[PDB]
């Protein structure tokens with residue numbers, strides 16, 4: 103397991119340019135989205151929480167396709183505001199309930215260092 107904690111202050115530096123294998127070593131779920139919400143990376147810990155197959159979701163749109171319960175002001179709306187400002191950094195709890203047992207989580211969405219890239223980190227609460 104990579105020795106990185108959820109919520110750490112420089113998480114975007116520690117995870118910068120991590121390949122898929124390295125991302126699979128985190129204690130928490132990690133998704134990388136483009137500015138439209140298309141899925142670029144999705145780790146094993148996230149697939150274990152949500153049931154999704156980390157290989158199959160790459161290229162799908164998170165808000166339109168995979169996670170319609172996040173297509174709301176409280177998740178997608180916050181994401182797109184942070185994308186626009188270039189300073190996305192928000193941590194909030196949320197419930198995931200599309201075609202799954204409702205699962206309450208803490209979400210941390212933060213701009214990635216790579217261009218047109220945004221992290222969504224997830225752990226259970």
Ligand SMILES: *C(=O)/C=C/c1ccc(O)cc1
Pocket residue numbers: 133148152154168169170171172197198199200
């Ligand atoms: C609501 O539809 C949430 C769905 C969901 C959240 C996070 C994921 O990694 C996958 C699906």
